[PDB]
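Subject: Interface between my chains keeps coming out wrong

I've been trying for a while to get a sensible model of this assembly. When I model each chain on its own everything looks fine, but I need the whole thing in one frame so I can look at the contacts. Pasting all components below, labels as-is. Any help appreciated, I'm running out of ideas.
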Amino acid sequence: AMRLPDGTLQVMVEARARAQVTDYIPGPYLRARGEVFSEIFPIDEAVVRVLVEELKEAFEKYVANHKSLRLD
Amino acid sequence: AMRLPDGTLQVMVEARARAQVTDYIPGPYLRARGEVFSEIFPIDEAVVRVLVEELKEAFEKYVANHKSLRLD
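Reply #2:
Try treating it as a single job with all components included. I did that and got this:
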């Protein structure tokens, strides 16, 4: 948590788990509660590894076609 | 800039950058407002390096195609 000298809030976040929204409170600042935290762990991890391999091959096919687009 | 005594001022320049001429002030000699050193380098330097080596080899093949012209 740091401050920048031009009225702009710089912060680094790291996401843990997604959630639903219970009720919308008017703002600013906007407030909302979470009904449950929707979380999951990989079931039958061999098929999970196969899908990771297929997605790795897809993203390797994705990054090779760049001449002036500037994707790092 | 070696001061030659034959009415000619042969200047040796290792240039810096191109710039847009915003306006011209009448002379001679002329004043011209331009822009700053256009010398920055963007992200994705790997495509820059690959196209640099390909441009190098393309001129290396090009100058062989104009040895009929005896290009330098």
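Reply #3:
Confirming on my end. The two ends of chain B are 25 Å apart (CA to CA).
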